[PDB]
Amino acid sequence: LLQFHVATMVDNELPGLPRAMQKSGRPLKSLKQRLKGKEGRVRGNLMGKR
Protein backbone atom coordinates (compact mmCIF):
# COMPACT_ATOMS: atom_id res chain seq x y z
CA LEU A 1 0.00 0.00 0.00
CA LEU A 2 2.82 2.42 0.81
CA GLN A 3 4.45 1.73 -2.56
CA PHE A 4 1.16 2.27 -4.36
CA HIS A 5 0.48 5.51 -2.53
CA VAL A 6 3.91 6.97 -3.28
CA ALA A 7 3.80 5.91 -6.93
CA THR A 8 0.40 7.57 -7.26
CA MET A 9 1.79 10.63 -5.49
CA VAL A 10 4.50 11.06 -8.14
CA ASP A 11 2.67 9.26 -10.96
CA ASN A 12 -1.12 9.00 -10.92
CA GLU A 13 -1.46 7.07 -14.19
CA LEU A 14 0.16 3.64 -14.43
CA PRO A 15 -0.20 0.82 -16.97
CA GLY A 16 -2.94 -1.48 -15.71
CA LEU A 17 -2.67 -0.51 -12.05
CA PRO A 18 -5.73 1.07 -10.42
CA ARG A 19 -5.90 4.86 -10.61
CA ALA A 20 -5.94 6.83 -7.38
CA MET A 21 -9.36 8.48 -7.12
CA GLN A 22 -10.49 11.15 -4.68
CA LYS A 23 -13.36 10.17 -2.38
CA SER A 24 -15.52 12.70 -4.24
CA GLY A 25 -14.95 10.60 -7.37
CA ARG A 26 -12.18 12.32 -9.33
CA PRO A 27 -8.57 11.31 -10.03
CA LEU A 28 -5.69 12.87 -8.14
CA LYS A 29 -3.32 15.14 -10.07
CA SER A 30 0.12 13.67 -9.46
CA LEU A 31 3.29 15.71 -9.92
CA LYS A 32 4.02 14.05 -13.25
CA GLN A 33 0.60 15.21 -14.45
CA ARG A 34 1.48 18.62 -13.03
CA LEU A 35 4.19 19.04 -15.68
CA LYS A 36 3.67 16.11 -18.05
CA GLY A 37 2.85 18.23 -21.10
CA LYS A 38 0.82 21.21 -22.24
CA GLU A 39 -0.97 23.14 -19.47
CA GLY A 40 1.92 21.98 -17.28
CA ARG A 41 4.91 23.87 -15.92
CA VAL A 42 7.31 23.87 -18.86
CA ARG A 43 4.93 24.61 -21.74
CA GLY A 44 2.31 26.12 -19.46
CA ASN A 45 4.29 28.57 -17.35
CA LEU A 46 7.87 28.79 -18.69
CA MET A 47 7.63 28.86 -22.49
CA GLY A 48 4.12 30.30 -22.44
CA LYS A 49 2.94 32.70 -19.73
CA ARG A 50 0.35 35.41 -19.23
Added chain:
DNA sequence: CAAACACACCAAACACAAGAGCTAATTGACTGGCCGTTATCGATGTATATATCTGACACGTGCCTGGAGACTAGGGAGTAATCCCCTTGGC
Protein backbone atom coordinates in the same frame (compact mmCIF):
# COMPACT_ATOMS: atom_id res chain seq x y z
C1' DC B 1 26.60 -30.90 -26.76
C1' DA B 2 26.93 -26.22 -25.38
C1' DA B 3 27.61 -21.19 -26.39
C1' DA B 4 28.17 -17.00 -29.50
C1' DC B 5 25.24 -13.72 -32.45
C1' DA B 6 21.72 -12.74 -35.88
C1' DC B 7 16.79 -12.57 -37.60
C1' DA B 8 11.78 -12.89 -37.43
C1' DC B 9 8.09 -12.74 -34.44
C1' DC B 10 5.38 -11.67 -30.29
C1' DA B 11 4.38 -8.92 -26.40
C1' DA B 12 4.71 -4.62 -23.75
C1' DA B 13 4.67 0.65 -23.28
C1' DC B 14 5.22 6.40 -24.49
C1' DA B 15 3.96 10.46 -26.24
C1' DC B 16 1.59 13.43 -29.48
C1' DA B 17 -2.55 14.96 -31.59
C1' DA B 18 -2.50 24.17 -33.83
C1' DG B 19 -2.71 29.09 -31.49
C1' DA B 20 -5.80 30.36 -28.61
C1' DG B 21 -10.23 33.75 -27.10
C1' DC B 22 -15.19 34.25 -24.59
C1' DT B 23 -19.38 32.55 -22.04
C1' DA B 24 -22.49 29.29 -19.32
C1' DA B 25 -23.57 25.63 -15.30
C1' DT B 26 -23.02 20.78 -11.35
C1' DT B 27 -20.67 19.11 -7.97
C1' DG B 28 -21.83 22.62 -1.53
C1' DA B 29 -20.30 13.60 2.17
C1' DC B 30 -21.74 10.37 5.23
C1' DT B 31 -23.36 6.17 9.98
C1' DG B 32 -21.27 5.15 13.84
C1' DG B 33 -18.86 5.46 18.70
C1' DC B 34 -17.76 8.37 21.97
C1' DC B 35 -17.06 12.65 25.01
C1' DG B 36 -18.90 16.96 26.37
C1' DT B 37 -23.31 20.24 27.15
C1' DT B 38 -27.35 20.51 28.11
C1' DA B 39 -32.68 18.97 28.46
C1' DT B 40 -35.35 15.85 30.70
C1' DC B 41 -36.96 12.42 34.28
C1' DG B 42 -36.76 11.38 39.09
C1' DA B 43 -36.20 11.87 44.74
C1' DT B 44 -36.44 14.74 48.62
C1' DG B 45 -37.62 18.30 50.45
C1' DT B 46 -40.13 22.76 52.35
C1' DA B 47 -43.79 26.31 51.22
C1' DT B 48 -48.69 26.86 50.45
C1' DA B 49 -53.59 24.96 49.68
C1' DT B 50 -57.06 22.06 51.45
C1' DA B 51 -59.32 18.41 54.79
C1' DT B 52 -59.96 16.36 59.51
C1' DC B 53 -60.06 16.89 64.20
C1' DT B 54 -59.85 19.74 68.63
C1' DG B 55 -60.59 24.04 71.25
C1' DA B 56 -63.11 28.53 72.37
C1' DC B 57 -67.20 31.28 71.49
C1' DA B 58 -72.15 31.62 70.16
C1' DC B 59 -77.10 30.42 69.91
C1' DG B 60 -80.29 27.05 71.45
C1' DT B 61 -82.40 23.23 74.21
C1' DG B 62 -82.68 21.10 78.60
C1' DC B 63 -82.59 18.92 83.59
C1' DC B 64 -82.71 20.48 87.83
C1' DT B 65 -83.53 23.61 91.81
C1' DG B 66 -86.07 26.80 93.92
C1' DG B 67 -90.12 29.92 93.47
C1' DA B 68 -94.73 30.89 92.48
C1' DG B 69 -100.45 30.02 92.12
C1' DA B 70 -105.24 28.55 93.83
C1' DC B 71 -107.40 26.72 97.06
C1' DT B 72 -108.10 24.94 101.66
C1' DA B 73 -108.23 24.40 106.97
C1' DG B 74 -108.61 26.40 111.28
C1' DG B 75 -106.87 29.31 114.34
C1' DG B 76 -103.90 33.74 115.05
C1' DA B 77 -104.82 38.45 115.17
C1' DG B 78 -108.25 41.56 116.49
C1' DT B 79 -113.63 44.84 117.88
C1' DA B 80 -116.52 46.11 121.47
C1' DA B 81 -117.39 46.25 126.97
C1' DT B 82 -116.07 45.82 131.41
C1' DC B 83 -113.55 46.09 135.87
C1' DC B 84 -110.86 48.46 139.07
C1' DC B 85 -105.89 48.83 139.82
C1' DC B 86 -103.21 52.51 139.89
C1' DT B 87 -101.56 56.70 138.14
C1' DT B 88 -101.69 61.69 138.00
C1' DG B 89 -103.04 65.41 140.60
C1' DG B 90 -104.02 68.42 144.93
C1' DC B 91 -103.23 71.00 149.67
